[PDB]
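Quick one: examine the sequence and fold tokens given here and explain what the tokens say about the fold. Here goes:
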Amino acid sequence: MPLNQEHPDYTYALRAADGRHAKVNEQILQQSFILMPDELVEHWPVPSLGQLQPAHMDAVLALNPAVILLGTGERQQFPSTDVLAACLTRGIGLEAMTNAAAARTYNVLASEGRRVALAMIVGGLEHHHHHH
């Protein structure tokens, strides 16, 4: 018998990440969130990496992953070198990509079965821009 049961619920799948929005199954997220093969962490109050610090990634470090895929939506920017220090010492593979690219790498790692932390930041919090 498959010994992976007891309220496993339904396996969430990422359908499409455009960079400003993220379509998780049928859920449209427009913020920053952490997806892992354990649960979905919607609560990540870091919409901009200008506040990105191990102190706010502590929750991520507490989960203790092997590789962390950071999606910068469509606005690619690298995390503070301060963050890299904490990652390097633990041996954490922190990768900064776009949501489109991260979705591909996450697919591979999901099939590998290795603990990957998918941190998606979608830079699409705004609405109807200026034209009416």
In short: Strands lie at 14-17, 22-24, 27-29, 32-36, 39-41, 67-71, 93-97, 116-121. Residues 66 and 88 are 11 Å apart (CA to CA).
